[PDB]
Chains A and B, each alone.
Chain A
Amino acid sequence: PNALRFHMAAEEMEWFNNYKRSLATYMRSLGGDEGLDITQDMKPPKSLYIEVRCLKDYGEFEVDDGTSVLLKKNSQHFLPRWKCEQLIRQGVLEHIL
C-alpha cells in the first residue's frame, strides 16, 4: 500500500523489487508447469469451504472465468477456502464461526 511505501528509501525499493523478481522465479520452477506458490497454506487445512463477511467496501472480485461477486460492506458469502485466504490475511474479509 502507498501509505507504507512512504517510509522506504529509494535504494530500499530497488532491493525489494529485486527480491520479488528472484523469489517469483524460484517458485515458478519447482515442478510440473508453473510450479507452486509456497506463500499460501499458512495453517493446516480443516475443510473445503468457509463463510466470509466483508469489512470494507471493495471492488469486483473474480471467482471463476467471468463470474464475480461485489464486496460491499456487511455482505456475506460462502466460498472455497483457497480463494479467500490472502484477502483474510490483508484484512478485507472476516472468517465467521
Chain B
Amino acid sequence: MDAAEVEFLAEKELVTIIPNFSLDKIYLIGGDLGPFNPGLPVEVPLWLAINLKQRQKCRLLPPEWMDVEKLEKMRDHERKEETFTPMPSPYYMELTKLLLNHASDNIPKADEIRTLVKDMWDTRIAKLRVSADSFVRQQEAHAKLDNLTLMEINTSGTFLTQALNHMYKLRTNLQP
C-alpha cells in the first residue's frame, strides 16, 4: 500500500463548508447531500470540499480539534506516556496537509499548528523504532498496537515484517 492509497482513504472524512450559491439535495451512491444554500453551512466529504474550494465556490471551517490550546496539551501527554496515546482523528497527518495547503486563508494560526503536529509525528515514530528493535532482540512472537494509525504503520511496517519472516525461518531450521 502506497501513501497515495492511504490518502485516498483519508479523503472520506466529513467536513463543514459554507457555499456561495444554491443547489437542491443531491443523491449519491454513498449517501444524500444538501440542500446547498448561500451563506449557510453544510456537511460534505473532504474530496468534495477541496474541489469546491479550488473552483472558488465555498469557504472551509477548521475541525474543532485544530486548536493551539488543544494540541499543546495533546503533545505534552504524548511525550510523557510510555506507550502510544489515542489521537484526535485516525487520519490526523493527511487532514493537516490537505487543509493547511488549500485553506490557510480560512484557518487562523496555521504556522503554529504545523509545528505542533510535526512534534507528535516525531515522538510516535521514535517509539516505533524502539519497539521494532526490542521485538527482534528478545525473539518475541506477538505484540499489541492499540493506538497506531494507518499512515504510521504503512511508513515503517514493510521493513519490519520482511525481517521477521527471515528470522522465524532461521530459528526453526533444526526440526523439519
Are A and B direct contacts in the complex by CB distance below 8 Å? yes
Q: Dominant SS at the A interface?
A: loop
What residue in chain B is nearest A45 (Cβ atoms)? B8
- Size category, A interface: under 10
What residue in chain B is nearest A48 (Cβ atoms)? B51
**From residue B11, how far is it (CB to closest CB) to chain A in Å?**
9
Give chain A interface residues in 47-84, CB to chain B under 8 Å. 47
Give chain B interface residues in 4-18, CB to chain A under 8 Å. 4-5, 7-8
Interface flags for A34-46 (1: CB within 8 Å of B; 0: not) read 0000000001100
Interface flags for B138-153 (1: CB within 8 Å of A; 0: not) read 0000000000000000
How many A-B residue pairs have C-beta atoms within 8 angstroms? Tell me: 6
Give chain B interface residues in 31-61, CB to chain A under 8 Å. 51
What residue in chain A is nearest B7 (Cβ atoms)? A44
**From residue A67, how far is it (CB to closest CB) to chain B in Å?**
25
What residue in chain A is nearest B5 (Cβ atoms)? A44
Cα distance, A44 to B94, chains bound together (Å): 15
**From residue B22, how far is it (CB to closest CB) to chain A in Å?**
23
Chain A hits for B51, CB < 8 A: 47
Cα distance, A62 to B5, chains bound together (Å): 32
Cα distance, A52 to B159, chains bound together (Å): 37
Cα distance, A47 to B50, chains bound together (Å): 11
Cα distance, A44 to B7, chains bound together (Å): 9
**From residue B154, how far is it (CB to closest CB) to chain A in Å?**
14
Cα distance, A44 to B8, chains bound together (Å): 7
**From residue B135, how far is it (CB to closest CB) to chain A in Å?**
32
**From residue A49, how far is it (CB to closest CB) to chain B in Å?**
12
Cα distance, A39 to B37, chains bound together (Å): 41
Cα distance, A44 to B6, chains bound together (Å): 10
Chain A hits for B8, CB < 8 A: 44
Chain A hits for B5, CB < 8 A: 44
Cα distance, A43 to B8, chains bound together (Å): 10
Please name the 6 residue pairs, one residue from A and one from B, whose CB atoms are nearest each other, closest first. A44-B8, A44-B4, A44-B5, A43-B4, A47-B51, A44-B7
Chain B contact residues, CB within 8 Å of chain A? 4-5, 7-8, 51
6 pairs, A vs B, C-beta closer than 8 Å: A43-B4, A44-B4, A44-B5, A44-B7, A44-B8, A47-B51
Chain A contact residues, CB within 8 Å of chain B? 43-44, 47
